[PDB]
Amino acid sequence: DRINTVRGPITISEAGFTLTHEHICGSSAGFLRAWPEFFGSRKALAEKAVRGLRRARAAGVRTIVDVSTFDIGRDVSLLAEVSRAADVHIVAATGLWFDPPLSMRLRSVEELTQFFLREIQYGIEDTGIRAGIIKVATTGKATPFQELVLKAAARASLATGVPVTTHTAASQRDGEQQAAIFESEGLSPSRVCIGHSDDTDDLSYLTALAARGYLIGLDHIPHSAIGLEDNASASALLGIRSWQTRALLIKALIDQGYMKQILVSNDWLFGFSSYVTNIMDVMDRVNPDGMAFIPLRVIPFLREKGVPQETLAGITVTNPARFLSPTLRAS
Amino acid sequence: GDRINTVRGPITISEAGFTLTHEHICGSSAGFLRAWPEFFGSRKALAEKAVRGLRRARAAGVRTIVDVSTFDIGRDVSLLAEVSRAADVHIVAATGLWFDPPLSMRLRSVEELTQFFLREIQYGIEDTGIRAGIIKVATTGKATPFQELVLKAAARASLATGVPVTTHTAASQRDGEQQAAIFESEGLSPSRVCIGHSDDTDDLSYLTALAARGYLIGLDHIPHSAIGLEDNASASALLGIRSWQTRALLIKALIDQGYMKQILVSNDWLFGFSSYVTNIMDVMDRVNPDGMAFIPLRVIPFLREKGVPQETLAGITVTNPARFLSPTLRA
Ligand SMILES: OCCc1ccccc1
Ligand SMILES: OCCc1ccccc1
Ligand code: NA
Ligand code: NA
Ligand SMILES: [Zn+2]
Ligand SMILES: [Zn+2]
């Protein structure tokens, strides 16, 4: 009946319109604290995040799920501060992305399970802030270490009921391997969201996963390097497909009957150090709406394409609630 | 330079006294200790262990240690300051980058890295005001492209501040030669550089040639040995099969070749170690129960017994470190 946020537990009904894959800051463990000037200042970053969150809130966003793990440099204190200042619920994550340091990479599945459980059950660091989701990732075939992470993520989810969300190389169909690993651990597909799924047009891939019960994360909607074909780093990161092409995947999935398995987001951020310098500026120019892009542009676009109001509400409110609600497997 | 920066503030050169130049309170990863303190029992337990060990080293005559843990070694300056104060041992903190930088660091330019190192030396680490007194870098064989950038930034930061540079090397692969070339290409004086883990090789030719050029030779792995643990692969790979006596004899060898003024001795010890296999700490503590006190309790006496005069021993353990650590700008 309750979802853990950086301000404490909230009831399922309080979540409202939720963005399921976002970040306050995309960084590295200890980075923000060791070199805050990379972002101007910690204060400047916080203020930027507050402005953006307030704008998203004005557009109807009530909660965001910050899928920043330990290795994405998640700073829960920052999350709590901006959540309170902007009055937006923020769900924190545990798990490991693709940049784990040696102290993590050398751990066993059992040790990692303990670490994920710690963050979900006791709290992140010494803050008492409990994670409400487990984030994992692969970029093509999983590495041996990534397989361990996925297994530990499954074990932690099974013990706590918190869902798992992933980063994929959609092109490479990472989702299938991820699903395989999760199922080998007994995890229900309904507890998993296969992310960045809009990065591919393979509707066969998407639909096959949906059919098995997985949640499909169409969270890269505003990501596009169109108009910047000349910026190699940006093109590499953002792609050359339009936001409309990506958004159309939502309707496609709806049309195929999987409206209840879709999760939409922007995968936006206010600071980004884990890539080339200046990527944030480039991204902000591409999508000035930031996290508000979904409600301001995507939802109206889909409605214009014939998606009914109730399906839109179902996707942005109902689906996230059901996914985030901690749910233990029936015995 | 009339003062050396320590975690408790500046000290005069005379106050350094007997100094261990390559040590660690804890060998970890950025943000690891704060995120998963239970890996070490607890933060409190680790601190207590460190205080006991530092107090024992102090009883044996050690007055200062140089903790060469960088951002990526998970250096926690607050922990260092706490233990320094509780044990009453001076601790010099480091800046630089070891071999496990996260993406936020690895994507940076030489100019960016330079600014980060300067920040830690001139202003302070994190928001603590604790200023680094040394710059740590590393290679493990031929430098990676990023490592070349790190070495160049380290040289630039050293040139602007006067603080020395110390390195991690794959000694048997003669990394010191490439390191030296890079440093020299930036105009850094060899006298501001310590080529570490030099006792890991039996190639005296390599060591004397670097000494002849003015570099400091760090014979800092003296107690590291897996003799008696052949059966333990991880430990063997890490510690080697050469005896502590064989390593200590290199100190004598260099003295005999006329380079007593260019030798720095240490143990490369730690109280916690998460960046390797689990349980490595226990294995190490069994191998060398004296921990950091190994140098003064066993090595100095051993050398004396082999004919090294007291004045020479004092010069190596007090004078050399003082000269090295004193901030010195190029004329
Ligand atoms: O009950 C059907 C309403 C609904 C539509 C879309 C997604 C979840 C719920
Ligand atoms: O000649 C001065 C005495 C000395 C000996 C060894 C190292 C540093 C100094
Ligand atoms: Na919980
Ligand atoms: Na300084
Ligand atoms: Zn993301
Ligand atoms: Zn070391």
Name the nearest CA neighbour of A163 among A132, A140, A136: A132
Handedness of CA B281, B236, B140, B217 (dihedral sign): positive
Residue A27 to residue B125, Cβ atoms within 8 A = no
Instruction: Indicate which residue's Cα is closest to atom 3 of ligand 1.
Output: A314
Residues of B in contact with A274 (CB under 8 A): 102-104, 107
Residues of B in contact with A111 (CB under 8 A): 39, 278
Active-site residues of B: which are they?
22, 24, 136, 168, 197, 200, 221, 268
- Find tokens 């200890």 and name the residue: A30
Which residue stretches of B88-239 are H helix?
A: 103-106, 110-118, 145-161, 175-185, 204-212, 233-239
Residues of A in contact with B74 (CB under 8 A): 30, 101, 103
State the DSSP code for A315: I
Residues of B in contact with A126 (CB under 8 A): 34
Q: Token pair of A74, please? A: 């998640």
Cβ atoms A133, A164 nearer than 8 A: yes
Instruction: Indicate which residue's Cα is closest to atom 4 of ligand 1.
Output: A314
Specify the amino acid at residue B288.
Answer: N
Question: Could you say which of B74, B105, B119 has the minimum Cβ distance to residue A28?
Answer: B105
Q: What is the dihedral of CA B197, B200, B203, B207, to 10 degrees?
A: 10
Residue B32 to residue A103, Cβ atoms within 8 A = yes
Listed in order, strand segments (DSSP E) in A34-92 are 63-66, 89-91
Distance B124 CA to ligand 4 centre (A): 8
DSSP B273-316: E-SSSTTHHHHHHHH-TTGGGHIIIIIHHHHHHTT--HHHHHII
Per residue in B62-88, is it b (16+ CB within 10 Å) or e — as a string?
Answer: bbbbbbbbbbbbbbbbebbbbbbeebe
Cα–Cα distance measured from residue A249 to residue A254, given in angstroms and rounded to the nearest whole number: 8
Residue in chain B lying closest to A75 (CA): B31
Instruction: Name the minimum distance, in Å, from the CA of A187 to any CA of chain B.
Output: 25
A319 lines ligand 1 (CB under 6 A): yes
User: What ligand is nearest to the CA atom of residue B119?
Assistant: 4
Cα–Cα distance measured from residue A90 to residue A81, given in angstroms and rounded to the nearest whole number: 10
Q: What is the dihedral of CA B206, B212, B215, B220, to 10 degrees?
A: 50
Which residue stretches of A256-327 are H helix?
A: 279-286, 293, 299-304, 309-313, 319-324
Within an 8 Å CB–CB cutoff, is residue B104 touching chain A?
yes
Question: Could you say which of A99, A108, A111 has the minimum Cβ distance to residue B102?
Answer: A99
A322 lines ligand 1 (CB under 6 A): no
DSSP A138-165: -SSSPPHHHHHHHHHHHHHHHHH---EE
A288 by DSSP, 3-state: which? Answer: coil
- Return the bridge partners of A89, or none: A63
* Mutation for testing the B interface, residue in A42, A102, A108, A126 having most B CBs under 10 Å: A102
- Return the bridge partners of A11, or none: A2
Residues of B in contact with A116 (CB under 8 A): none
- Find tokens 């074909």 and name the residue: A229
Instruction: Indicate which residue's Cα is closest to atom 9 of ligand 2.
Output: B315
Question: Could you say which of A27, A103, A114 has the minimum Cβ distance to residue B275?
Answer: A103
State the DSSP code for B147: H
Cβ atoms A61, A299 nearer than 8 A: no
**Other CB atoms within 10 A of residue A43 CB:** 10
Within an 8 Å CB–CB cutoff, is residue B12 touching chain A?
no
User: What ligand is nearest to the CA atom of residue A124?
Assistant: 3
Specify the amino acid at residue A102.
Answer: L
**Other CB atoms within 10 A of residue B306 CB:** 13
- Where is A252: in which H helix or E strand? helix A243-255
Distance B199 CA to ligand 4 centre (A): 30
Cβ atoms A251, A294 nearer than 8 A: no
- Find tokens 């980060």 and name the residue: B116
Residue B103 to residue A275, Cβ atoms within 8 A = yes
Q: Token pair of B293, please? A: 């006190």
Question: Could you say which of A29, A102, A107 has the minimum Cβ distance to residue B31?
Answer: A29
Distance B263 CA to ligand 2 centre (A): 10
Distance A320 CA to ligand 3 centre (A): 17
Q: Which of residues 268-327 of B touch A (CB under 8 A)?
A: 274-278
Cβ atoms A179, A192 nearer than 8 A: yes
Residue B109 to residue A70, Cβ atoms within 8 A = no
- Find tokens 């001139």 and name the residue: B122
Question: Could you say which of B28, B103, B127 has the minimum Cβ distance to residue A103?
Answer: B28
φ, ψ (nearest 5 deg) of residue A21: -150, 95
Q: Is A289 assigned a catalytic role?
A: no
φ, ψ (nearest 5 deg) of residue B22: -145, 95
Angle value at C-alpha B325, between B321 and B329, nearest 5 degrees: 135
User: What ligand is nearest to the CA atom of residue A123?
Assistant: 3
Cβ atoms B248, B264 nearer than 8 A: no
A260 lines ligand 1 (CB under 6 A): yes
Cα–Cα distance measured from residue A222 to residue B250, given in angstroms and rounded to the nearest whole number: 62
Cα–Cα distance measured from residue A83 to residue B314, given in angstroms and rounded to the nearest whole number: 58
Cα–Cα distance measured from residue B325 to residue B19, given in angstroms and rounded to the nearest whole number: 10
Query: Which protein residues touch ligand 2 with a CB less than 6 Å away?
Result: B 260-261, 311-312, 315-316, 319-320
Residue in chain A lying closest to B103 (CA): A274
Cα–Cα distance measured from residue A209 to residue B306, given in angstroms and rounded to the nearest whole number: 72
Report how far apart the first and last C-alpha atoms of chain B are (Å, whole number).
Answer: 13
Cβ atoms A203, A249 nearer than 8 A: yes
CATH fold of the domain at A1-331: TIM Barrel (3.20.20)
Instruction: Name the minimum distance, in Å, from the CA of A106 to any CA of chain B.
Output: 6
Distance B289 CA to ligand 5 centre (A): 46
Which residue stretches of B60-141 are H helix?
A: 77-87, 103-106, 110-118
Q: What is the Rg, in whole angstroms, of the alpha carbon atoms belonging to chain A?
A: 18
Name the nearest CA neighbour of B215 among B286, B279, B164: B164
Cα–Cα distance measured from residue A184 to residue A142, given in angstroms and rounded to the nearest whole number: 15
Instruction: Indicate which residue's Cα is closest to atom 8 of ligand 2.
Output: B315
* A/B interface, count of CB pairs below 8 Å: 95
User: What ligand is nearest to the CA atom of residue A308?
Assistant: 1
Q: Is A21 assigned a catalytic role?
A: yes
